[model samples]
Every structure is written in C-alpha cells, then in structure tokens.
Target: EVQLQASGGGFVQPGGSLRLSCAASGATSERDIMGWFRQAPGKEREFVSAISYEPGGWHYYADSVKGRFTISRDNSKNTVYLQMNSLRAEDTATYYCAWQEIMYGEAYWRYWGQGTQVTVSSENLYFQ
Candidate 1:
C-alpha cells in the first residue's frame, strides 16, 4: 500500500486561485496514474483531472475545469501538485489526490490523501 499526504488548503475569495500538494511515500514508477477529486460542500464528489504515462505522458481533465485547473507530478519527489484558478463561490470543498494502481487492464484508486479543506468565499459575487 502507498501513503499519500496532502497539504495547502484554507480560504479563498471569488475569482482568485488556489494550490495544493500531495506527496507520496512509495515506489513511483513511470506508468503510475494519479488524479484529483473535489468534494463540494454538501454535494457529491466531482472528478477534477488526471495525469499518467502509458504510450506517452498525457493529461485528462473534467469538463468543469477544462481551462483553469491542472494536476502535475514531480517523479523525483513523488509529489503531485494541484493548481486551480478562477475560483468561484461554488468551489468550496474538500480536495483530495488519489493514486491509481494499474493492474492488468484495470485502473483503480488504491491510495488517498487526507484531503485539504478549502472554503471559497462569495466576496466578489455581488451584483453591480
């Protein structure tokens, strides 16, 4: 089993940015698959994005965060970074980064971080 520790979370105002980190303590191979998930306040969990190397290195993002969010990894430190931009009022949630184990033809989330709690403020969501 792998160990994942995540950090960097707090509060943010509207139309801003936030960043998080997930460092792993295990064997990280070239074919490792990793991704981030967002659990909105009082709502269902949402898939954020994924990064992996198979035929080649690739990134896959959810439709909700197609433009202003990304997940990247530093293989040397076995750490994953989640950079988010254009924060909205609905962005308040607990964010988690998970390790996807590739076994045979199936890929499943086997390791998970403690999660970072983010509270997005509506300070800029006022009507002019």
Candidate 2:
C-alpha cells in the first residue's frame, strides 16, 4: 500500500502564513488527486483542496477557502503543498493530506498523512 508523511513547522499567528508539505511513495503522482483537509483545534474535518499530475490541475472547496488559501504540487518530488496566507486566529488548526479515491461515482479519501497542527495566537507572533 502507498503512504504519505508530513513535515512542517507550526503555530502560525495572525498576519502570518502557514506552509506544509506531504511526501508520498509507492504510487505514481498521476494516478490520483492528492487532497488536503483542515480540522480546527476541536472541530470536524473540512475539505480544502486537491491536485493530480494527470491534468496538473488544482481544486478547492471555495466556500471553505477564503482569499489567502492555496494548494499546489511538485510532481517531480511526488509531493503536494498547501499554504494559508494572512492567517487569523481562527486559522489555527491541524492539517492533513490525503490521497483521493472514487468508487462507482463517489469521491473520498483513501490514504492520509498524520497531520500538522498550527495555532494562531497573540503571544506567539510567528512561525517559521
């Protein structure tokens, strides 16, 4: 089975940005859409976006994403990246990257990276 791992810094504050990456192995990048989701400190997961090397296109749940969110890929490295810009306190959340799968006509996740947590706070001014 294929797998993914996430490595990134945490605790982004207001006015800053959060960046994360997911590394995958055991499968080709063109085979499926790499999806990302966010879970606020104690809330349910929210779909953010997805991408695949086939069309090399990006897709996002626009209603859930605002002005400062982005999803991208680096096919050469079999990696996917996500960034949230000009973040606010509410942006604090745990982010996960997953591989999308379809059955019949339904779409959902098949594999997921553990997660990386970010916190937006007044005292913690920045994250690197």
Candidate 3:
C-alpha cells in the first residue's frame, strides 16, 4: 500500500519561482526510486525528472526544462521536492509524483499521487 501526497501553490506570476512537494509513505526507505511528471491541460503526462537510489543519482527527461527544474529528496521527512524557476504561462499544468517498483522482471511506477494543478499567469491569483 504505497502512497504519495503532493502539495504546492497553484499560481505563480511569470518569471517567478515555484516549489512543489510530495510526501511518501508505506515504502521501505528513502532509497526507493522516485519520479515526477507534469500534464498540461487536456494533454498527456510529460516526464520531468527522476531519482535513482541504486547508484544514487538524478536525471531530467527534457533539455528545455533542465536548467530551470530541480528534483531532490528529504530523507529525514520522507519527502520529495520539485523546484522551478523563471516560470512561464506554458508551465501551467498538473504535477504528479510517483515511485518506481519492480514486480517479477518489469519495472514501473507502482504508486502515484493525485496531481496538483498549477497555474502560471501574469495576473496574481491562486487555486486549490
């Protein structure tokens, strides 16, 4: 019964910074592999970043967001953090957190959190 819980602000002005968090439970250790993704409105999920615990490292899926996006873990709190700087309207989307697991011989995301909807706009506003 693995579970992930995500939280973050829903609005960010253009060029502003954003921070999102995911708390994980029911997993064995902070060494578990974790990943993050974003889904644009009416669009499919896009891979963002991932952390591997086997060799212990981080990786980004796309080069465009590589400079602005960062993923990290807080093992003390059982939490994962995603940070984005210099946001644009195109950044508006739903962000999700997931953990990878190996069953039999295949590896996949076995648990996912209800995504957090984020809206980036020049106008200042917030949403839950």
Candidate 4:
C-alpha cells in the first residue's frame, strides 16, 4: 500500500512564504507519480502541480498557481515539496500531498495525506 505524510507550518502572513513536504512510503520506484492540491474553505479541490519521472521528467501546473507555486521531488528521499510564495488571506486552505494513479488513460489521486490546514493572515506573523 502507498501512503503520504505531510509536514509544514500551519500559518503564514500576507506576502510570506511556506514550504510543505510530503514523504512517500511503500513505493519502490523513484518514478512514482506525485502531486499537490489545495482546497479553500467550503470549496472544491484545486490542482496545484504534478511531477512525473516517466517520459523523462515532466511537470504540469495549474495556471492560477503556475507562477507563485513550485513543485519538486527528491528521488533519493521519496519526497515531494510544494513551495508557495506571496501568500494572501485568500490562500487559507487545506493543502494535500497525494500520489497520482493512472488508470486507462485517466489520472487521479490514489492516496492522500490527512491534509495540513494553512491560514494566511493580513498581519505580520511567524509560524512555528
């Protein structure tokens, strides 16, 4: 079975940045697919970015977060990183790290983390 664990700060101030890490276990191949998503309060899930090793390394990203968000992978550690910068209050949402599964030419998240709640405030702040 595959699993993912997410770790990162839960709070950020406007104009700040945050890095979320997702560690994968039970996967033998470094080519295992991975992706990041965000869900605003009371809203549907939104795709952030995805990275795959097949076809010789590829990355796909959603336009809304294309510039401010970056997704990368560490094959040696079996982990993926999601970095977001210039956060705003509207950025408050639940972020998820997931393993992507492809079935019959379709793709979706087969496994996901429990989710990390991220809150962005207008005031200057420090996240612990």
Candidate 5:
C-alpha cells in the first residue's frame, strides 16, 4: 500500500528555524508529485510548495513563503523535505505532506501524512 510518513521538528520557539521530512512507502516513479502544506489553528490549510511531476521537474512556492520556506526531495530515499526559517508566532501549525495520484480525469493527493504539529513558542520546544 502507498503511504506517507512525515516527521520533523516541533514545538519550536518564535523566530526559530524548522525542518520536516516526508517519506513515501510505495512510490517508484519520479513523476509522483510531492508537496507540503500546513493548517494554522482553525484556518484552512495552504500549500507551501510543490514539485512538478515531469522529466524536468519544476518547483512552485506559495508567494507568501517564497522567501523563507523551501521544499525539496531526496530521490535515493524517496523522501521530500521542508525547511522554514524566521518562524513567527502564527507559524505554529500542523504541517502535512502528500503524494499526488493522477488518473485520466482526477488528480489529487491520494495519501497524506498523519501530520506534524509544530508549535512555535518560547517556553518549550520539541523535535522528531
């Protein structure tokens, strides 16, 4: 079965840097799309970045995070990673990564990670 397992630094302090990883279990094609997104509190989630599924892959970043967030991959490990610097108080969120499934008529994220909750604060911190 195809699965996504995401892991990363969590409970970070405000203004700190963070990184996350997502590993795929059953993906063999480089054409499989890998991407990162996050949900802040009660708000809807937003895509942080995405890597295109093509021979010459392209990366797309959200304008809001174009400067401080980066998402890339390790083909050897079949894993994707995310890094963010200059985190803010509102940067605390549940980050998710997913692999896209494309068919003749449907293209969507078929499997998502359980999600890593990154809590930005000053009193405490944690990592995975």
Candidate 6:
C-alpha cells in the first residue's frame, strides 16, 4: 500500500507566508492526480484544487485569480508543496494533500496524508 506524510512548521502568524510539504511513498507515476484541501476552523470543508504535476515536471493550477494560493512539487523527491501568501486568522485549519484516482472520466481522492495544521496565532504555540 502507498503511504503519505506531511511536514511543515507548526505555527504561522497573520500576514505571513506558510509552506507545507507532502511526501508520497510507493508509486511514483504521473497517472495519479494530487490535490489539497482546507478545513476551516468551523466550516465543513473546501477543495483548494487539483495539484498540477507534470510527468516529470511541476505545474500549478490557478483556480482563483486572487493569487493567494500556489502549489508545487518535486518529482525527484516524491514530494509536493503548498504555499499560502498573506495568511490570516481565517486560514487556521488542517490542510491535507491527497492522491486521486485519475481515470478516463472520473477522478477522486483515494489516498491521503496524515494532515498538517498551521494555526495562525499572534502568540507562540507548539504541537505536541
């Protein structure tokens, strides 16, 4: 079976940029689609968008023109990255990167990382 792991800083302050990484182990093929999702403090959920990874290159999807969101990957390391700019208190929540079963017609998440949370706090806090 495939495994996924997430690694990044634990805390991010308001108006700061946060970067997270997700590593995949097992299959390393371009046949699968990667994605990222944001879970708001109290909201149900939100789909950031499908991570655009080239067969052996990197690409980013621009779902919104706001330019606050950016995604990237390193095929050489079997890892992907998510970069959020000008983060606010509202960005506090757990973020996850997943692999989708890309088919001819339908594509959906089949594997998921453990999840990494970045709390946007003015004060210092640590994860245990």
The per-residue C-alpha lDDT of model 3 at residue 1 equals: 63
Q: Write the residue-wise lDDT of candidate 2 on 89-113 in tens digits.
A: 8767777777777778888776775
Q: How would you encode candidate 1's per-residue C-alpha lDDT over 1-128 as one tens digit per residue?
A: 56566688888888889888887556357436777788987789887888773336588889888888777778676677888898777768888877787678787765775889988785545677
The TM-score of predicted model 2 comes to 0.81
Model 2, backbone clash pairs (residues 3+ apart or across chains), number: 0
Model 1, residue 35: displacement in angstroms? 0.9
lDDT measured at residue 93 in model 4 versus the true structure, 0 to 100: 86
Mind giving the per-residue lDDT tens digits that candidate 4 earns over 1-128?
Answer: 56676678587788789988888655546437777788998899987788774447677788877788787777788677888887778778888877777779787786785788889986544698
Off by over 4 Å in 1: 53-56, 102-105, 123-128
Q: Could you tell me which 10 consecutive residues in candidate 4 have the lowest summed lDDT?
A: 24-33
- Give stretches of model 6 more than 4 Å off: 55-66, 102-105, 124-128
TM-score of each: 0.80, 0.81, 0.81, 0.82, 0.80, 0.75
Stretches > 4 Å off in candidate 4: 28-31, 53-56, 124-128
Worst 10 residues of 5 by lDDT: 23-32
When summed lDDT is taken over every stretch of 10 residues in candidate 6, the lowest stretch is: 57-66
TM-score for model 1?
Answer: 0.80
Per-residue lDDT of 30-75 in model 5, one digit per residue for the tens? 4377777789888998877787544477887888778877777777
Q: Distance from true position, residue 40, model 6, in Å?
A: 2.7
lDDT of 3: 0.76
Instruction: Name the weakest run of 10 consecutive residues (lDDT summed) in model 3.
Output: 52-61
Off by over 4 Å in 2: 124-128
Task: Report the candidate with higher TM-score, 2 versus 4.
Answer: 4
Give the TM-score (vs. native) of candidate 4. 0.82
Name the candidate, 1 or 6, with the larger TM-score value. 1
Deviation in Å, model 3, residue 99 alpha carbon: 0.6
